Design a protein around this ligand. Structure first.
Ligand code: HEM
Ligand code: HEM
Ligand SMILES: CCO[C@@H]1C[C@H](CCc2cc(F)c(F)c(CCc3cc(C)cc(N)n3)c2)N(C)C1
Ligand SMILES: CCO[C@@H]1C[C@H](CCc2cc(F)c(F)c(CCc3cc(C)cc(N)n3)c2)N(C)C1
Ligand SMILES: C[C@H](O)[C@H](O)[C@H]1CNc2nc(N)[nH]c(=O)c2N1
Ligand SMILES: C[C@H](O)[C@H](O)[C@H]1CNc2nc(N)[nH]c(=O)c2N1
Ligand SMILES: [Zn+2]
Lengths: 416, 414
């Protein structure tokens, strides 16, 4: 393999040189003869073995002591020695608080699909490795939401639950996000609420939830601790900051009755640090406008409001070449940004966000020797070519520590 | 080495890809690093040794395509190409193979959203051409046929293959019809900034520039490795659309216009090991190629500020989405203008819809369709088109269109 890789920005002619790719660890799914960069996901009861774990822990501990300019120190060699002994006598090991914090920050720093990574170093890490029950999971998660929401001045956070052991005692948040809206399939095939969450809502309802059956019902937390069956918990509604969507120029836009929650918090991913697997690690930041305005509101298999918005704009909807869809999508995304800003809820438009990412990516090349980025995800779902990332060549590779996907818990859980 | 599935996440349609098992050119990716966003991922004169397998493979898929694999014609066409590579170090394609080759290079073009049309391709054989005047003649016939008074038709003209690398046929323009770009004394750029260097090459070669904003560049034609020569396309062959908006009547005051015929002239057509370094090909525009990229790139006409100015939009903050609002209007005007002048154009909703249908077809009858998501997804309104939620496998099939160095970096004058 080659030691230097060049990427070019075709708008500004800047050429950057990647050496960091040499440290990539996992497979991309691509080979010499096929590229899978547009594939979304290129037994979970199986856990790492002693001999698998020794080099994974050593690699991470080396990286950690290199970051603190203590590589090869006495502290470093004693840490290696200590971790090798735990793995030998228990087939696992425990991270120090400082290592858990470094690893989490670096999982975000390595997240090739995240346009927000300029902020990676500023991440509040909540250590919840002492949790044993689902009530305690709920307690930890409520503090996360409250801290991260911060009355509208959102702060990025992660809460980390105990690592996997034998695979039969996993902690999971069954929710895909801490805060989502319920989706109710109707007898007539229509959908009330959020179509993306129909399946999860049926699971909550089965487990005992009484749904209000409205358009914006915050789902309950479904929490699994130490491998037990999950348990329901209603987030205190005063902890769920919401934003009603109105438009600066169109008086009627509030009449759609749209609102959205302020805190995007992914809760279904796996955090891998030095070969340890933290199956429950909800993390939160703040929204880029387009995630709400374009996808959540205008995807066909979502709230699907372009039609109704276009009707109220009186657009010719008979032919596609009028571009009525594109015209309504922009107004929708103006109303989303206008609403969050009026209510002083942190949010970022796709211009500012991509602009920050280019600056971040250049800094990482300069100071770190590269910045893995997944162009298919970094480029916003609207107005792509008028943002700087569109013209930026990117290298995509998997560095550890990292956030990974994992199967849905209802597909694997053994019921007590 | 398996059948691979691709999922559409809107419709949940899953297609199974076997065609990739037949590819042999490289993508640029590795198990550890993906280069799906590198534009040109990573001398060229092959010898007899490399040439016969490539040729044998191409004849194989040709006779396979016409339901006569392993026939007498197939046996004999193999030995004819064998003898010919043997003695002359190259070989000549039949007319049928040439047509089949050009159509399948289009069909194999991962970056092209317009491939549902791939087999309606008019192939002009120009392999008898020897001079730049002959090139100019074949190019004028191409432009006249493909334009067709507005009802455009897909066409490719194929000049002689590369031989020793010293006698290359090259069209120095990147497209047959483009506007010129001028560096100003005050620093700015008049016309099209992407063509500033090529415009100076033409001026240096004797061209007298009008120094307007939409000046059609002359053809610069290189035949058999000689110095390129300048030719003016007859203006009556150059169809142009003045851009006006159906709601904003001030839009015509902008004085914008574009040409009707997109005709890529700087690529290399590779068929069965043969290199056609001159093969201008043309179809018709997707509205966004003009209205998003040509007019609204920073490194191009960069007209967004002017438009949102006349729309009287709040341009202080980025979060008013004033760029995005002006972009849709510009792209309505392009589509409105072309349709009103009855020049063939497709909008990015209809084209991506067609490409999905094309994909279904190719998976049905061919077992796959190589597709470059990065290039297939339109440069605006991405996720409200069907291709955004379409998984695509990218892989390199031949015959194919490849990039080649710009001639002014390679050519040795005299
Ligand atoms: C602070 C502001 C943040 C912004 C503006 C932001 C922005 C984004 C966006 C727009 C995406 C694409 C999401 C999608 O389209 O589904 C994304 C993905 C992602 N982000 Fe960030 N994010 C932020 C915070 C974070 C934090 C705090 C973490 C981890 C500590 C993180 C890790 C990730 C990961 C792992 C993905 C990939 C998710 C997936 O594959 O589904 N992000 N981010
Ligand atoms: C007939 C209507 C056609 C439409 C609507 C269409 C559409 C497109 C578009 C939008 C692109 C991306 C172009 C860019 O951003 O530079 C593209 C690329 C491409 N098209 Fe098509 N196309 C058409 C015809 C053709 C024909 C007739 C050929 C060949 C005979 C062809 C071969 C290619 C190739 C090789 C590329 C890749 C260009 C590159 O890598 O720079 N296309 N097409
Ligand atoms: C199924 C139909 O469309 C679906 C919708 C979804 C649209 C994008 C999206 C919508 C959300 F509401 C959401 F919470 C996230 C979370 C991502 C995230 C995480 C963090 C930490 C910060 C931040 N800003 N964002 C992403 N996309 C995956 C496909
Ligand atoms: C450097 C960054 O900016 C640049 C701008 C440019 C914008 C895209 C573009 C604009 C054109 F005017 C054009 F003719 C073509 C030709 C493509 C084509 C070929 C055929 C056969 C048919 C058809 N319909 N289109 C493409 N894009 C490559 C990047
Ligand atoms: C960096 C990136 O590869 C480059 O800017 C690409 C992105 N996608 C594109 N897609 C199309 N259709 N045309 C282009 O020129 C580009 N440019
Ligand atoms: C098919 C394709 O892989 C898929 O639709 C991707 C495209 N890019 C994306 N980009 C972001 N940010 N989020 C997404 O969900 C997707 N979906
Ligand atoms: Zn790849």
């Amino acid at each position: 393999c080659p030691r230097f890789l060049k990427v070019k920005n075709w708008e500004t002619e800047v050429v950057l040189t990647d050496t960091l790719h040499l440290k990539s660890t996992l497979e991309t799914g691509c080979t010499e003869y096929i590229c899978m960069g547009s594939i979304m996901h290129p037994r979970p009861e199986d856990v790492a073995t002693k001999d698998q774990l020794f080099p994974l822990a050593k690699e991470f501990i080396d990286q950690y002591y290199s970051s603190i300019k203590r590589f090869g120190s006495k502290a470093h060699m004693e840490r290696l020695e200590e971790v090798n002994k735990e793995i030998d006598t228990t087939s696992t090991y425990q991270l120090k608080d400082t290592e858990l914090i470094y690893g989490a920050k670096h999982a975000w720093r390595n997240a090739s699909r995240c346009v927000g990574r300029i902020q990676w170093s500023k991440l509040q890490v909540f250590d919840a490795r002492d949790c044993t029950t689902a009530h305690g999971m709920f307690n930890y998660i409520c503090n996360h939401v409250k801290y991260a929401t911060n009355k509208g001045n959102l702060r990025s956070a992660i809460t980390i639950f105990p690592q996997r052991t034998d695979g039969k005692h996993d902690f999971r948040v069954w929710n895909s996000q801490l805060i989502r809206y319920a989706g109710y399939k109707q007898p007539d095939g229509s959908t009330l609420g959020d179509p993306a969450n129909v399946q999860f809502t049926e699971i909550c309802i089965q487990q005992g939830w009484k749904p209000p059956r409205g358009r914006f019902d915050v789902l309950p937390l479904l929490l699994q601790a130490n491998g037990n069956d999950p348990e329901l918990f209603q987030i205190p509604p005063e902890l769920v900051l919401e934003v009603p969507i109105r438009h600066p120029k169109f008086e009627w836009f509030k009449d759609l009755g749209l609102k959205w929650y302020g805190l995007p918090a992914v809760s279904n991913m796996l955090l891998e640090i030095g070969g340890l697997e933290f199956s429950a690690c909800p993390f939160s930041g703040w929204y880029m406008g387009t995630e709400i305005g374009v996808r959540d509101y205008c995807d066909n298999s979502r709230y699907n409001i372009l039609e109704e918005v276009a009707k109220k704009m009186n657009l010719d909807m008979r032919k596609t070449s009028s571009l009525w869809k594109d015209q309504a999508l922009v107004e929708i995304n103006i109303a989303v940004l206008y609403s969050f800003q009026s209510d002083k809820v942190t949010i970022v438009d796709h211009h500012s966000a991509t602009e920050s990412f280019i600056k971040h990516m250049e800094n990482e090349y300069r100071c770190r020797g590269g910045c893995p980025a997944d162009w298919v995800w970094i480029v916003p779902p609207m107005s792509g070519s008028i943002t700087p990332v569109f013209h930026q060549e990117m290298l995509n590779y998997r560095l550890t520590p990292s956030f990974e996907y994992q199967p849905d818990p209802w597909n694997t859980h053994v019921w007590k």
